[PDB]
Design an enzyme around this catalytic site. Sequence first.
Site, PDB file in Angstrom:
ATOM      1  N   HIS A  41    -101.496  28.504  -3.370  1.00  0.00           N
ATOM      2  CA  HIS A  41    -101.407  27.084  -3.693  1.00  0.00           C
ATOM      3  C   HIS A  41    -101.343  26.197  -2.452  1.00  0.00           C
ATOM      4  CE1 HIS A  41     -97.152  26.703  -2.697  1.00  0.00           C
ATOM      5  NE2 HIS A  41     -96.819  27.658  -3.547  1.00  0.00           N
ATOM      6  N   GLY A 143     -90.873  23.421   0.970  1.00  0.00           N
ATOM      7  CA  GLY A 143     -91.377  23.963   2.212  1.00  0.00           C
ATOM      8  C   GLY A 143     -91.056  25.424   2.433  1.00  0.00           C
ATOM      9  N   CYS A 145     -91.987  27.887   0.409  1.00  0.00           N
ATOM     10  CA  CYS A 145     -92.979  28.786  -0.171  1.00  0.00           C
ATOM     11  C   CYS A 145     -93.632  29.619   0.926  1.00  0.00           C
ATOM     12  CB  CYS A 145     -94.043  28.007  -0.943  1.00  0.00           C
ATOM     13  SG  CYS A 145     -93.382  26.779  -2.090  1.00  0.00           S
TER      14      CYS A 145
HETATM   15  O1  LIG Z   1     -92.383  25.167  -6.859  1.00  0.00           O
HETATM   16  C1  LIG Z   1     -93.446  25.000  -6.246  1.00  0.00           C
HETATM   17  C2  LIG Z   1     -93.449  24.769  -4.818  1.00  0.00           C
HETATM   18  O2  LIG Z   1     -92.245  24.748  -4.193  1.00  0.00           O
HETATM   19  C3  LIG Z   1     -94.609  24.599  -4.116  1.00  0.00           C
HETATM   20  C4  LIG Z   1     -94.698  24.319  -2.673  1.00  0.00           C
HETATM   21  C5  LIG Z   1     -93.977  25.075  -1.741  1.00  0.00           C
HETATM   22  C6  LIG Z   1     -94.079  24.796  -0.391  1.00  0.00           C
HETATM   23  O3  LIG Z   1     -93.384  25.507   0.547  1.00  0.00           O
HETATM   24  C7  LIG Z   1     -94.907  23.767   0.055  1.00  0.00           C
HETATM   25  O4  LIG Z   1     -95.007  23.491   1.388  1.00  0.00           O
HETATM   26  C8  LIG Z   1     -95.631  23.015  -0.868  1.00  0.00           C
HETATM   27  O5  LIG Z   1     -96.433  22.010  -0.401  1.00  0.00           O
HETATM   28  C9  LIG Z   1     -95.536  23.296  -2.216  1.00  0.00           C
HETATM   29  O6  LIG Z   1     -95.814  24.598  -4.769  1.00  0.00           O
HETATM   30  C10 LIG Z   1     -95.886  24.817  -6.119  1.00  0.00           C
HETATM   31  C11 LIG Z   1     -97.164  24.817  -6.647  1.00  0.00           C
HETATM   32  C12 LIG Z   1     -97.303  25.029  -8.012  1.00  0.00           C
HETATM   33  O7  LIG Z   1     -98.529  25.039  -8.585  1.00  0.00           O
HETATM   34  C13 LIG Z   1     -96.179  25.233  -8.815  1.00  0.00           C
HETATM   35  C14 LIG Z   1     -94.929  25.222  -8.262  1.00  0.00           C
HETATM   36  C15 LIG Z   1     -94.752  25.016  -6.888  1.00  0.00           C
END
Ligand SMILES: O=c1c(O)c(-c2cc(O)c(O)c(O)c2)oc2cc(O)ccc12
Lengths: 303, 297
Positions: A41, A143, A145
């Site tokens: 994503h 951030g 993820c």
């Molecule tokens: O919970 C989610 C989330 O935290 C992130 C996310 C994490 C990161 O670390 C980032 O930098 C960022 O931009 C987005 O993306 C998602 C995308 C989805 O389709 C569904 C749920 C999430």
Amino acid sequence: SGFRKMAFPSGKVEGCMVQVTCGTTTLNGLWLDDVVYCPRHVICTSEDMLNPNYEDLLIRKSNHNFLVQAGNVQLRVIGHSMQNCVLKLKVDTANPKTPKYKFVRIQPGQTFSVLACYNGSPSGVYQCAMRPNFTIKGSFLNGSCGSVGFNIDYDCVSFCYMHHMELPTGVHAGTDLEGNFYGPFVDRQTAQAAGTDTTITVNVLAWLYAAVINGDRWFLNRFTTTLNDFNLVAMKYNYEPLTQDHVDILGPLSAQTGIAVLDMCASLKELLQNGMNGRTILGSALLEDEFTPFDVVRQCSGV
Amino acid sequence: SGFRKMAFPSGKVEGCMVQVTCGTTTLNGLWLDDVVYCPRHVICTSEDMLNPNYEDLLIRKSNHNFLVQAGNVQLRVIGHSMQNCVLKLKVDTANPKTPKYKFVRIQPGQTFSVLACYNGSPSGVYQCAMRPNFTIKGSGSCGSVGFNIDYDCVSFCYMHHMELPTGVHAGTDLEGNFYGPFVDRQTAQAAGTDTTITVNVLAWLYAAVINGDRWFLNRFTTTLNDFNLVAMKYNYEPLTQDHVDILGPLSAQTGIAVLDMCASLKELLQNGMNGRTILGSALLEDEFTPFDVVRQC
Ligand SMILES: O=c1c(O)c(-c2cc(O)c(O)c(O)c2)oc2cc(O)ccc12
Ligand SMILES: O=c1c(O)c(-c2cc(O)c(O)c(O)c2)oc2cc(O)ccc12
């Protein structure tokens, strides 16, 4: 002496954490050999999140659209590929800090350490369990993820978890390092049900064994029970059913404390039916289920 | 979101851990620049433990009586010195993995991570607080160190020396000075009556509010002194104005006056939680400083 919820030493994993940017989204990636792994994503904008078509979104990206930074070093992206829910970025430089490593999928109730990172930089490390419903109760700010969970055999890191998202309930969901989600989850911003969670019974039993090892014997009865009588109680209190496989892996702890597993089950039955009456076990008024039998043995002479 | 008792990433300390053997005693050492630091009781035999004279014992030791192994290689000990309760073994090789580092002595109630090691090798890492009585409830291990990390600089604050007969752990700063009244002898030693770290409990209640657990909040109020009268009864550390001041940023971000949180804690002490939990715990948690909550949230 004492008993702590200890995480694995994180140095081997710290040397693998990189920052991955695509479009305006930045998150963590895992750099092993010449491949960087991150949640797919990263290619989504805020307008894609509801129902993204990842193949279509990826098709509009080129190698130069991914910025991978390792400390103060940009890596050159020489290829990209999507595998299930993770993106694999082929880079021109193998990670000189690559530990010996395996990719592993774990079973519910198993434990691992999480190295929580933000935009490539470690912030802290903690030990947790994969819930029976395939979620984890972690600490993942926005951030986070791409942060990964792992175990260490001796000098080999078994990567088992990559963080993708926080569910509307506040719990966290992710994949193995082949991009397959633990549980029924999909990487979309929709409400998604986690299954009814249960307590990891074999872990509670292991932790009661740890309590005996540390002198906390007050909960021990000499009542006994059958495996199936115990499981009837476990079902009532939303505990995972206890199997012979669980009894088998509690063997070494049964031997050390001289307590038959079914006697410990009978004592746990009393705890479930009567409560603790304000008493504590290893400093907790709740029954702890984030130590596997292996974790308990391991803390009692590890490395 | 979510809230975990997280430890510092341990890599900068893993690269500093070595194995130190003297006589037949082996324990952990810390290798920074060209010095290896370790508990001085490494020079004791099993016959010295009761009442050692460390100056006499060290005088009978030479540089070749200390075996320092860094992974797969021996280091050459080219000098030895005793500073309070730690040895400094001068070696001919500077640690190529020396992080930016400081030696810090911490205050009771402050937190740090421990890299628990055995005979030079890491076993695991955990987050803990220095108890008000200067002991540590932690988990061959002597010489393991506690530390904080600012950004790229490791402030070493703790070295483990011994288990007290109660099972709790006691140790020194990295200048060899013990936290608390303890001495490195194998004698029964009392730790003071421990108390709960009040300012840490309050910080953790703020973390609970940040993560949605608001049920304990009330508009019932309290003075600093009415609260401290309650705190004494329940064996809680008295709350000072310094403590109120460092809880400021949490008060500012959450919109909850420090004294309002104190009044909420007062009710928790007097009534209990009545079977409810806060951040998944049925007990009041005192191992998060206000700083720890702020950096994690
Ligand atoms: O919970 C989610 C989330 O935290 C992130 C996310 C994490 C990161 O670390 C980032 O930098 C960022 O931009 C987005 O993306 C998602 C995308 C989805 O389709 C569904 C749920 C999430
Ligand atoms: O509790 C104590 C302890 O654990 C060790 C110890 C630790 C290690 O890691 C070793 O390898 C080792 O040989 C000994 O030494 C002590 C020495 C004292 O004078 C008083 C108490 C202790």
